[PDB]
Amino acid sequence: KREHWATRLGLILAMAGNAVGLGNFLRFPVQAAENGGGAFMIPYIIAFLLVGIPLMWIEWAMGRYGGAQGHGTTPAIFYLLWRNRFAKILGVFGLWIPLVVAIYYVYIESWTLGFAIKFLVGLVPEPPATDPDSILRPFKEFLYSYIGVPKGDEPILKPSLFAYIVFLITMFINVSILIRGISKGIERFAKIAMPTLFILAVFLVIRVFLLETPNGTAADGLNFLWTPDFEKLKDPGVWIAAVGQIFFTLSLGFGAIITYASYVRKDQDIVLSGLTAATLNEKAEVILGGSISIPAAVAFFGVANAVAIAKAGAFNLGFITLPAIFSQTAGGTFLGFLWFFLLFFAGLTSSIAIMQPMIAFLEDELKLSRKHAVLWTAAIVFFSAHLVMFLNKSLDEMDFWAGTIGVVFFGLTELIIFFWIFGADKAWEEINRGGIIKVPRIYYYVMRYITPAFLAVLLVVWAREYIPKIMEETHWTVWITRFYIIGLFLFLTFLVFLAERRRNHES
Ligand SMILES: CCCCCCCCO[C@@H]1O[C@H](CO)[C@@H](O)[C@H](O)[C@H]1O
Ligand SMILES: CCCCCCCCO[C@@H]1O[C@H](CO)[C@@H](O)[C@H](O)[C@H]1O
Ligand SMILES: CCCCCCCCO[C@@H]1O[C@H](CO)[C@@H](O)[C@H](O)[C@H]1O
Ligand SMILES: CCCCCCCCO[C@@H]1O[C@H](CO)[C@@H](O)[C@H](O)[C@H]1O
Secondary structure, eight states, rough: OOOOOHHHHHHHHHHHHHHHTTTTTTTTHHHHHOHHHHHHHOOOOHHIIIHHHHHHHHHHHHHHHHHTTTTOOOHHHHHHHEEEEEEEHHHHHHHHHHHHHHHHHHHHHHHHHHHHHHHHHHHHHHOOOHHHHHHHHHHHHHHHHHHOOOOSSSSBBBOOHHHHHHHHHHHHHHHHHHHHOOOIIHHHHHHHHHHHHHHHHHHHHHHHHHHHHHEHHHHHHHHHTTSTTTTTOEEEEEEEEHHHHHHHHHTSHHHHHHHHHTTTTTTSOSSHHHHHHHHHHHHHIIIIGGGGGHHHHHHHOOOOOOHHHTTTHHIIIIIIIHHHHHHTTTTTHHHHHHHHHHHHHHHHHHHHHHHHHHHHHHTSSSOHHHHHHHHHHHHHHHHHHHHOOOTTTHHHHHHHHHTTTHHHHHHHHHHHIIIIIIIIHHHHHHHHOOOOSOOHHHHHIIIIIIIIHHHHHHHHHHHHHTTTTTTSSTTTTTTHHHHHHHHHHHHHHHHHHHHHOOOOOOO
């Protein structure tokens, strides 16, 4: 009846693949540097222990629970968990979030593929020594020419022809994997991509470790992230930043886990498999990820400038700073190729995970073939992405409502539906059923009180500090993007309507 993962190992590597592309290498280093890396470890571990693990297991169980009844998607899974019309409209969010994220994410993934192509061939800017900004500016210009950034006032992006071609290639590659299916495509690619990612990261970590400059060494930069500033541990903002990173550490709230877990067999383990996968992502995020960006930056610019450059963001550190830092070292363009090849493969395992929920919806509810479901989903993403490519703050706008506010809000709804409405006793049985290991009794208290309290705190905080703080100082072109992604929610709600009408006719 339903597709299933062939092997336990490929399932875990596939699941681990979702979180890797969502800034695993870039986000964690920045959050630690802003909040004191050594000090930041304790909040990060508490959040991973009291938020990430419980929610991951909740998502795994909801996916597998729905997959037994033939549904991999939250409109139907919520309705099975909660027999109410409002659960179906709430489930639309769980389709909407991964779809909106995909609209701009695959485009960003294309940037790594294009940059990797340009670096491999050596078609990169070369700074002439040494001025911190004069090294950074020619690469900042390089990204802007690729994206088509205007002067600054204009809201129009003029993407390069090369960047458009690469976006098509990137989309075609996504389709090649997704069209093969769960085991022939996703699972086969994850068994190839994850080890390749591991070798590049380790290779990069060793290479970065050997970087030295009169401004500093890379070993000094590594020491900045493990020596604690215990005085910064008392700040509530560090705890707010720790919980938020965990969502990107494990790709919680994007719907990828649920849809993936729907192809887990009804009696297969989710307790050990999900715990292993979440451990893989955390180890890769801390060890491998938190050892390439910051240490290389500290070596070239010293500790002080590095924090000022780490405050420029995780994206400014990934496409401008690190390529400019590798630009000066021996074999540096090839190291930039490796860095960008790493990002692309990490993106590939993630872009296929957030496009699979829409593919599952068409198959499960509208009864489309995999071929048609993959192509139609590809068409919708490719078409909608023209908004992200040509409208200036459009990417930023989708990232906020879907990938920032949306995922955290949806994570709380998953908890309440499964553990409060569906029943905490029922949900506990569903989680631990078929488990190689069993969840400890303490997590029943955590999943029912601690985890929802932490999320509601993060939300109300992330709300008041982001949502209504500045609703008036955004340019008027943001309404274009808001109008479109609101139309997408109406489109999905109509499809859920059609799906019920066909299900009321198949009787
Ligand atoms: C395959 C479907 C094509 C849809 C066309 C989208 C609008 C065209 O897009 C433009 O194409 C030009 C070259 O063709 C590029 O130079 C421009 O960068 C790009 O903006
Ligand atoms: C692996 C393939 C990567 C994409 C290669 C296509 C690069 C498109 O690049 C374009 O090619 C044109 C020539 O036809 C030139 O006139 C344009 O200046 C150039 O931007
Ligand atoms: C595509 C047509 C959209 C029309 C835009 C809505 C009317 C303009 O609304 C604008 O919204 C901004 C929100 O940040 C405010 O800062 C501006 O003051 C306001 O003029
Ligand atoms: C913001 C919440 C409102 C978004 C638009 C929902 C209004 C449409 O209502 C929809 O009608 C359908 C009838 O079958 C039902 O399947 C859906 O559950 C219901 O949400």
